[model samples]
Target: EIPVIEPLFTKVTEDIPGAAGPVFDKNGDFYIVAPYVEVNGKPAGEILRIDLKTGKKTVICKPEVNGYGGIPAGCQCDRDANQLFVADARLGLLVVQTDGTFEEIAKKDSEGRRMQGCAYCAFDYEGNLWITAPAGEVAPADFTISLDEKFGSIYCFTTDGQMIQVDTAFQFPAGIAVRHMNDGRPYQLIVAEQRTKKLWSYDIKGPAKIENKKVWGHIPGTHEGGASGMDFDEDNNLLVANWGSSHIEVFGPDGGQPKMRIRCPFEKPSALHFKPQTKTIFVTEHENNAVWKFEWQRNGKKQYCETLKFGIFGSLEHHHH
Candidate 1:
């Protein structure tokens, strides 16, 4: 056990009803996606943007307000392109501008038809966009299959928007993140398996190229809810949102030794985003139709807990079960 001060949590915004995907802009302001089901989304799906400096938030985009339509899911900020990418199950992918307005990326098959049910979106080291869905169909089309089925497929789209199926064997993949080196080049991919309650990492050498799929870390019990929003610390440490347990766990950079675990007050706790510069963690309370923020102190003394009295740091390399 270690010594650290108790952190404080604050509700940063109620602009968007449900929380899912959260990403930050160049200026450090954060953005979150509001899905249709969890909370009362006025136009069904709303996009919430938060100002880091002023602590102010606003509903930047709603379906009818902007050309964007659909129940959105994941979000990613393009550091180089200065654009934001949001995934939606009903409308497909939305290319959001700095001001919150978005342009929809048309997802279609070779025969030229519209595609839907986009869940999580991640940008690889090569600027390609990767999305998770059931298959050719939008996930949750049969909510039964979305939660019940294993092997949720991941598709990769080139910079020009051509689709290619990459991984078709992931179990209930929900949230996705890319691992970047100190120089800011992405080399690995992190995935959250909702049904398996496990976090997975793959050697992402390039766009659509991957290998070495391994268990990153997991909660103790078998819970149906699974893990939700997944992100990385500056050191590539894993910050995972436990959907089943409504808790957030921070795994060490090497994946052993859970650095911290905080019992969450989220309704569904579907997603999370961390502001590195501010050391703040933003979590979405799905059914609560709200997003909350709390500051994180990763370097402080380990928390003094009975459970930790035994488990200082667990290692993936050591416990390869």
Candidate 2:
């Protein structure tokens, strides 16, 4: 069944030329950042936070570090919700606290190798930090991951700041989030390879190892397009942004068929977020330089459109790899 979602309210506004986010901070409000970073130039744009109740705004930032400048990209809140684990393309990985102060955790991994195009991150069930760094992509044109042996690597960091490369070398890897199994155990490490247009999951053995590499599913259509950022809804449904394709795809509890397809007017959609408290879904459109919101709307009565129809493949046939 195909379900189409339309934006209840969409707006175009920004302080930076480009945007990438949808991160919720300690106060339960959310933020979006304009990460216009030049490899060695000054970073632009202050992160913007929106008040969930009134829709008012505030700039979320503190100060600069050594003149390295900061282009805050992917910001994910820790499980306790007091601070955020952020990927700053120029200044390295940082921890932003509720007081507005921030600190660099590590720019290099355990081997002491510099991490270049670090993008997004997520927290494990234990609240540790894991991130994706497209180390070889130092410029804008490298937006999509390449199958180059050195294109990217995935790293795990302790909440207190230690860093190690848990998975190394791959196409440009982007968008990461943790998902748990039905029995309530931390199960798979879900990640998206932007260049390959493939979503892969690995079995999490401990804080350092992610084995049993398996293909979860393929982006609907992507000869040239790629996958972007992701997040799990409170219901545990996976929300994926289709980068070059311009839409948000909701796959879920079962990975084979899509539960919903929310189309947008943007040229490139970068990230997605769902706030369970407000019951709102937000999408960041990179090319359009805007963020849009969608609400769950329904009639009082159950209509025929609510009927169920499974895909042609089979019933609950979610075989991995």
Candidate 3:
């Protein structure tokens, strides 16, 4: 029997709907993105900060795109800068500070074309941000399924402030994460294509550079609904939110077949994230429009930023080199 997943919050207010991305900041505050929140009758995006002390959610900000509100999909915290990075469907890419201030970082591609919009964001060991745009000019109204057209593309914004399209021609690239060594050297980049049953892996050559593309692993679902958000545990096990299957599928580091499936109580489990420095995992569910948490058997692998202080700030070895 799968372990019982307990709901952390379920009140579906107008300001918070379609609970999507889950993340934690440097101060240990929980942040989740509501991509379908309404602003003046239009579907917009809002970031909500969940208070672990009292289980309260405070509206951080509603990102705007040219007077229209934005649709945020995935989010990650930049601990060094103390800001939250968001992949928006209307505004491209931007970041929000704790004081409710946000600035657009990229509105177009490196080739000087308007971006289709971003779906998810992940950072590598070198502090480069990887973004995914899973649709065309028009963003999806709800959870979208695509099997034929390859409209999605992956991009990397380097530390030196250069935007590069690393790869393109994906079905619906939803979630992305980097597998790295304990010393913070990224080796593999994995992206979850929501319209397909498989995850794609790319070899990390350098910042904004990847190659050796291959199928990382096949998840349990058809094109109807597939993988969403994913993260790696301390043991190197990959855990993916299998949206259509109503479960979190776990695959060993080798990555072929699923080693186990942790069943979810709700349908359309959108994203999964481990609380920073803890084994407690948080999941956002679209079916019940809520967030859930559970203790995992293993801790999450250290994020790149968590190790940045040691390598960039505290260490003197790099200066000598």
Better of 1 and 2 by lDDT: 2
Stretches off by above 4 angstroms in model 1 are: 1-6, 37-43, 51-57, 64-69, 98-101, 109-116, 134-145, 182-185, 256-259, 298-321
**Model 3 vs. true fold: TM:** 0.88
Which is better, 2 or 3, measured by lDDT?
3
What's the lDDT for candidate 2? 0.66
Per-residue lDDT tens digits for candidate 1, residues 125-174, read 45687777642354323222356555466667776667766676666678
RMSD for each model, in Å, please?
A: 9.1, 8.7, 4.0
TM-score of each: 0.76, 0.79, 0.88
Number of the top TM-score candidate: 3
Taken over the whole model, the C-alpha lDDT of each candidate is 0.64, 0.66, 0.79
Q: How many backbone clashes does candidate 1 have?
A: 6
Write model 3 residue lDDT over 128-213, tens digit each, in one string. 99888885543223333235789788899999888788888989898998887555577888899888888999999899989999
Give the clash count for model 3. 0
